């Protein structure tokens, strides 16, 4: 209550028509259903059941999320970007001596190190970040944890200090845009990480023919 | 009017004709950016004109 009323005075007024009258607002309702293909459901998973379809939405979101991290992981690692220091001081494993190759990084990294990565995912999957059935699919970060959230009507700030509220349907800033862009970059990275695996299986280059 | 697949896709991008911010809007911020752009354009003109001589900047043909 205190120190919050300056936002209302800094809030920019609602958009109107140029003549002076109030502006009249005058297919794609689900996240992942967007212009190019619309609802692309060749196998009709939505017809299998509401519980089965909710499973596939969380499954696409989770698969797409790890694929984006996996793609970004290889791209920095294959470039030569490394953390400073030792990955394993007991095994004399500097980061510089771990190969940029996906199979090379999968093999050189100690199994005790891989267990720590897996157990962190197990801890997140089983206790810390569980999907609440009441919550939206993919919303696994609990309250209290610092997460970038974009609720309907959240505030953004301009040069003079003026405040604009961003609706869900806003371009590049609404929740639906960021939700759609997460699913699509997840879908593109899902094909990307599998393509980088098979290209490196055949040639040894994850980004073949680039490089 | 004809409805096409691409036309239905691009339809919300052309659906806000005549929508304005009431009053002066963000004209004050725009004037600041215009004033900063004017000062910036004068700087790079006077550098080229050698009316502003910087410390390690020599306006002459460089090597490599």
């Amino acid at each position: 209550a205190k120190g919050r009323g300056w936002l209302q005075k800094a809030r920019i007024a609602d958009e109107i028509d140029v003549t002076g009258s109030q502006y009249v607002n005058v297919q794609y309702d689900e996240i992942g259903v967007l212009p190019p293909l619309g609802r692309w459901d060749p196998l009709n998973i939505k017809g299998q059941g509401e519980a089965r379809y909710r499973r596939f939405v969380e499954m696409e979101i989770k698969h797409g999320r790890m694929a984006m991290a996996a793609v970004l992981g290889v791209l920095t690692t294959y470039s030569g970007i490394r953390f400073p220091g030792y990955l394993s001081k007991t095994l004399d494993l500097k980061f510089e001596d771990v190969p940029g190759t996906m199979i090379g990084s999968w093999a050189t990294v100690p199994v005790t190190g891989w267990i720590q990565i897996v157990l962190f995912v197990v801890l997140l999957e089983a206790s810390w970040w569980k999907q609440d059935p009441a919550k939206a699919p993919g919303d696994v970060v609990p309250e209290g944890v610092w997460w970038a959230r974009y609720p309907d009507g959240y505030s953004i700030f301009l040069g003079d200090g003026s405040v604009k509220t961003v609706a869900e349907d806003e371009l590049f800033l609404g929740k639906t845009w960021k939700l759609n862009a997460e699913r699509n970059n997840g879908r593109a990275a899902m094909m990307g990480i599998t393509g980088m695996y098979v290209h490196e299986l055949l040639t040894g280059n994850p980004v073949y023919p680039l490089g | 009017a004809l409805r096409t697949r691409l036309g239905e896709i691009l339809r919300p991008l052309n659906a806000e004709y005549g929508k304005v911010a009431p009053g002066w809007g963000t004209t004050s911020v725009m004037g600041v950016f215009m004033a900063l752009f004017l000062v910036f354009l004068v700087i790079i003109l006077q550098i080229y004109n050698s009316s502003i001589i910087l410390e390690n900047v020599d306006v002459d043909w460089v090597t490599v």
């Binding site: 190019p36 023919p209 680039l210 | 096409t4 697949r5 239905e8 896709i9």
Partner: peptide, 30 residues
């Protein structure tokens, strides 16, 4: 020099992608 930046791969994939999207959007709405 002909193999630089992926060779002919990106122009072939890029041109095929543009042609496929045009054919995808060419049909009538209903």
């Amino acid at each position: 020099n002909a193999g630089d930046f992926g060779g002919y791969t990106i122009p072939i994939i890029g041109l095929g992608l543009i042609g496929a999207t045009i054919a995808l959007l060419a049909g009538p709405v209903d």
